[PDB]
Amino acid sequence: HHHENLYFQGMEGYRLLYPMRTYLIVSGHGEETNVMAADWVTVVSFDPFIVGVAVAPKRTTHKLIKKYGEFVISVPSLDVLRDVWIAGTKKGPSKLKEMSVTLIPSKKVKVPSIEEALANIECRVIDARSYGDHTFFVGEVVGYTYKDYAFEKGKPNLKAKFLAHVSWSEFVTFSEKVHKAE
Amino acid sequence: HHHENLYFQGMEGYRLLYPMRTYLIVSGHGEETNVMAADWVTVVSFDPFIVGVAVAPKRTTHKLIKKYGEFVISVPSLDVLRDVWIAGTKKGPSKLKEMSVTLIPSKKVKVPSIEEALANIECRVIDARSYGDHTFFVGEVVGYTYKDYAFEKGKPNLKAKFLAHVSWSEFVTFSEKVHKAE
Ligand SMILES: Cc1cc2nc3c(=O)[nH]c(=O)nc-3n(C[C@H](O)[C@H](O)[C@H](O)COP(=O)(O)O)c2cc1C
Ligand SMILES: Cc1cc2nc3c(=O)[nH]c(=O)nc-3n(C[C@H](O)[C@H](O)[C@H](O)COP(=O)(O)O)c2cc1C
Ligand SMILES: NC(=O)c1cccnc1
Ligand SMILES: NC(=O)c1cccnc1
Numbered sequence: 001h002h003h004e005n006l007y008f009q010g011m012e013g014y015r016l017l018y019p020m021r022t023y024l025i026v027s028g029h030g031e032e033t034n035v036m037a038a039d040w041v042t043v044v045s046f047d048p049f050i051v052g053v054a055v056a057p058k059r060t061t062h063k064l065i066k067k068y069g070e071f072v073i074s075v076p077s078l079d080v081l082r083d084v085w086i087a088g089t090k091k092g093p094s095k096l097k098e099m100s101v102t103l104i105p106s107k108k109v110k111v112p113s114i115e116e117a118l119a120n121i122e123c124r125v126i127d128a129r130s131y132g133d134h135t136f137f138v139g140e141v142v143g144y145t146y147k148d149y150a151f152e153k154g155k156p157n158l159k160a161k162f163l164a165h166v167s168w169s170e171f172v173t174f175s176e177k178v179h180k181a182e
Numbered sequence: 183h184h185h186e187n188l189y190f191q192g193m194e195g196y197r198l199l200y201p202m203r204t205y206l207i208v209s210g211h212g213e214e215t216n217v218m219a220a221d222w223v224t225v226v227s228f229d230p231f232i233v234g235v236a237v238a239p240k241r242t243t244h245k246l247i248k249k250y251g252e253f254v255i256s257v258p259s260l261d262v263l264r265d266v267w268i269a270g271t272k273k274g275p276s277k278l279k280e281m282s283v284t285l286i287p288s289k290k291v292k293v294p295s296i297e298e299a300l301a302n303i304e305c306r307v308i309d310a311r312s313y314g315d316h317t318f319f320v321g322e323v324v325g326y327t328y329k330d331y332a333f334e335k336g337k338p339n340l341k342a343k344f345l346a347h348v349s350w351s352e353f354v355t356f357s358e359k360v361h362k363a364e
Contacts (some may be wrong), residue, residue: 002316005228005229009352010336011333011337012228013323013326014228014337015229015333016301016326016333017203017208017223017224017225017233017255017257017303018329018337018357019203019338019340020203020224021199021201021202037321039225040224040225040346042223043196043199043202043221043236044222044234044236044313044314045236045314045315046185046187046194046308046314047188047312047315049314051199052224052234052313054225054226054227064328068243073199075198075199075280078361081329081361082363084336084364085364108325115197119198121195121198121199124271129309129311129320131226131227131234131320132226132227132229132231132232133228133230134228136234138311138313138318141195141223144195144198149191151197154192154197155193155200155352156197156201156349158201158346158348158354162201163331166338166360167337167338169362169363169364170337170360170361171360171361171362172357172358172359172361173356173357174201174308174348174354174355174356174357175354175355175357178348178352178354179260179263179352179353179354180352180353181211181264181266181267181353182267182351
């Protein structure tokens with residue numbers, strides 16, 4: 001498989017950063033609630049806590065983030081891969097009927113959270129910049145929830161099976177073997 | 183351990199996105215060549231290939247990226263953890279004497295590449311935005327090199343031991359067990 005619009009066949013340059021974590025991005029609310037898959041997510045500030053996500057203009061998610069100015073980063077486990085794949089292949093709110101997700105209210109944003117997620121990070125858009133073929137939406141974190149066990153020791157519990165993306169349809173989780181640097 | 187300037191003790195919010203990949207950021211050149219550790223790295227565009235990295239103003243790396251307008255993202259393996267830890271704990275160019283790294287010329291930028299890295303992604307700064315306590319440096323990718331075996335099948339070779347960060351001094355790599363979504 002290759003990314004769409006790869007005119008010169010070869011490995012996509014971005015693959016040099018892989019494997020990357022895979023998250024879900026929830027946008028909209030009510031009948032407009034949507035979810036997509038997103039790898040291109042990072043933290044951009046500690047205090048205040050701010051995150052960013054690169055979203056192509058053609059995503060339905062892009063329209064919904066522009067319209068409402070809010071999004072939720074929901075953290076999936078490997079056990080919900082089938083739902084992550086639907087989120088990353090089907091288009092728009094009608095896909096939710098196909099997904100094993102239970103929408104629950106957020107603490108602060110109007111966009112819902114996903115009950116099955118390991119964490120839900122509630123974001124308000126503070127910037128949108130166009131870089132190449134994506135918009136980088138920067139979100140101030142205004143709330144969050146998480147599954148106690150997934151972060152039981154004030155750090156990620158590797159038993160929770162955090163999801164990473166290797167290539168097109170190939171995913172993995174982490175080893176449970178921790179290496180200490182100090 | 184907690185991040186510096188965590189006034190209210192508890193798990194840092196950003197930890198909800200962890201584990202995250204750990205990269206190295208090379209900046210400067212000559213006697214000013216520097217390397218630091220960076221987790222807060224993502225892709226922001228496919229075509230053209232553009233990346234971003236969140237760097238605190240207090241990093242020596244910040245000064246060097248501002249001065250020269252270029253940086254290299256070098257991808258470490260778990261086998262070079264000791265060097266990654268020096269990059270992420272010591273300050274400025276004098277740390278290189280302590281690291282098992284061989285600097286080699288980049289293809290395009292003046293900042294050197296690291297021979298031992300799995301990949302070296304050469305970047306020219308196209309934007310710098312302040313979000314909270316970090317600058318988000320956005321870099322257009324103008325060249326790259328990589329170890330053939332690490333990406334042998336036009337995708338990451340999990341045998342290469344790509345590095346991820348769990349908590350302060352704790353690191354892991356990926357399982358080699360691939361899950362197919364399609
Ligand atoms: C694992 C995976 C990761 C993805 N990461 C991104 C991403 O970071 N940004 C993006 O714009 N699209 C990404 N996509 C593509 C969207 O998830 C996909 O186009 C989705 O169908 C869009 O749905 P929507 O139109 O309902 O927003 C990803 C897809 C997959 C399968
Ligand atoms: C694994 C790890 C990841 C890190 N990620 C970041 C990061 O994304 N951004 C940042 O500004 N500092 C990050 N740091 C902190 C810098 O690497 C660290 O402060 C380093 O000593 C700065 O070196 P310098 O002053 O030579 O630039 C990280 C540190 C470690 C150990
Ligand atoms: N173009 C994209 O945004 C993208 C990112 C990761 C996987 N597939 C597509
Ligand atoms: N403040 C930071 O930039 C940072 C990121 C990851 C680990 N330690 C510090």
